[PDB]
Ligand binder design. Sequence first.
Ligand SMILES: CCc1cccc(CC)c1O
Ligand SMILES: CCc1cccc(CC)c1O
Lengths: 168, 168, 168, 168
Amino acid sequence: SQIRQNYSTEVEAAVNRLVNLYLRASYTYLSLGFYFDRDDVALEGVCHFFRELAEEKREGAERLLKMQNQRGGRALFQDLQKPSQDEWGTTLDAMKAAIVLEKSLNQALLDLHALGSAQADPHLCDFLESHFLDEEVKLIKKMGDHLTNIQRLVQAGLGEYLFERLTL
Amino acid sequence: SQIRQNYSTEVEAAVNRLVNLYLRASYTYLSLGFYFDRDDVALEGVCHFFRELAEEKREGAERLLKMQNQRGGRALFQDLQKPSQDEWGTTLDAMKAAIVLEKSLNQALLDLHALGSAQADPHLCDFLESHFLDEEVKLIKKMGDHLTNIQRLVQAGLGEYLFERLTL
Amino acid sequence: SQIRQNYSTEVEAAVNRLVNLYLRASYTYLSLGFYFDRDDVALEGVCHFFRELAEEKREGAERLLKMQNQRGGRALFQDLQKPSQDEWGTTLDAMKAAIVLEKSLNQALLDLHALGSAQADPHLCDFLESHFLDEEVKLIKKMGDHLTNIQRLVQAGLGEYLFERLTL
Amino acid sequence: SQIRQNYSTEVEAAVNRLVNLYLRASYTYLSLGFYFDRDDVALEGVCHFFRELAEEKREGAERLLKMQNQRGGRALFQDLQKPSQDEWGTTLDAMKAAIVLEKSLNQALLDLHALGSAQADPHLCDFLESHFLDEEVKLIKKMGDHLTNIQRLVQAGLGEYLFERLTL
Ligand SMILES: CCc1cccc(CC)c1O
Ligand SMILES: CCc1cccc(CC)c1O
């Protein structure tokens, strides 16, 4: 590449993997959103919460792809694995599964930051810090806050309804 | 002081102590506010309630300091003791601890009013009446109203959630 | 903590200490502000300068406390020591004491950044860089500029008056 | 009087005396204002400061007269003594003379408050507190602040000019 400078093959490859992880997270949230839209689940606030997250994760993937080209690396796409579950249980179950998912994305971000630091690639390090690291910390805090409120609420059917109506 | 008139050393000293008490109350409310912001407590309305009170108590301290200088007394600051607890339990526990705190500030205000009256210092007496006495009575009534509603609500987890969502 | 990830006990503890340092700085500035409001000092611009800084330092402490919870650490408060002086001398004396204070806060920030880097905690490192490091550099430059102008001005009484009227 | 209730002859008489004191203060400030308007003194900011105070003191007298009638007492006017000086010296001299004057009015207010309290006349006590006591404390603080700045400024001719230009 005529533009490529200080951009290691290791980082290029890790950025392609992180794109896959963000698209997979987007897909998992799409499944979670539509599960809560089922007439036999019917929690519209929970559905909107996960659909909004699907869109956020897709946006993350696209920003990473933009960066990959800005640096002169080459986007390589892999299959996107189907989500780990077809049915997601209660709001509590689903929020637990979301925080597991977010912590795995955060750990991927931290790993790539570490790699960037080892490779002396400050543009990569700044890029993750300014667009992803604080967003993940904020989101995981929010999910943790939700999980605590869900747990304090679950006569389980009444709790789930009230959380969806008054928090989401 | 060239301006000092009818301002006893006793009152000057009691005003410095009351500044300390208001700053300590502010600090206690800061701790209460951040405790309810913990991801394993997560009651944002309770958090905002106490943070707003932190700011009110700090404002009170500053008005007292302004008055101290208006009268020609000299502000003397002491250490601010850390709050009595590191963790504040339930909303009920925290509201009980707040009303204990407010009654101790109110009693300090009443003591200083009594002192002012004994010293024939009507400016001090008017100052407490117009800026602090009615504010404390209003706040203690509000906390009493909250305590009653909290108590009537505590399936405890559901009650705490509903109070935070629908009152705070 | 269900949310805690890559957040060392060392950093958690250093963040609690830095909160104390910022609250202590806030308190020191409150004392400086009210000293310049004394009828026998009476430099209102100097008073507003330090009171504004009291508020900035309190805001800093609250942002650190917010971050502590966002990361799943636990806020622990200690006593707040009274400021080092009861009377602050001239504007020159007070500005010298402020720059000493700011350099000690800056060094604390730098120490915590170093710790964060040693612990591979990029979120902490970005947080200090984006909210505190440049603010301190800007403020210390401003105080240095003030100190130079104060010094060039001190017939001392006339200089102090003119600085307060035409700079602050 | 058909309306008179709980209004002692002692208080009625002291209120008439206080009216005289406020009108005398108004007159003294009128003289001070016009002295600083002399072409051989020529400090327009000092002139406006004292003329504004003339008007404030006259307003005070009129509020006291209104109150006297509201209570069913009878206004009795005495001669208004000419001010203590025909020429008022420097701004420093004049500000010293103003603070002496204000402290004598404040002491009169405090004496009348004490009388009102001895007579169990809470309307009188509230009236002085709400309209006069805090106004005097604020004004005496302001004059004290001015006196300190004037003193710090007095090459005397330059100091007097700068105070008038940059403070008043
Ligand atoms: C409002 C936060 C707070 C609490 C306790 C003490 C201080 C000193 C100013 C403070 O700002
Ligand atoms: C405000 C000028 C002034 C001074 C002193 C006395 C009187 C009588 C009304 C007056 O108007």
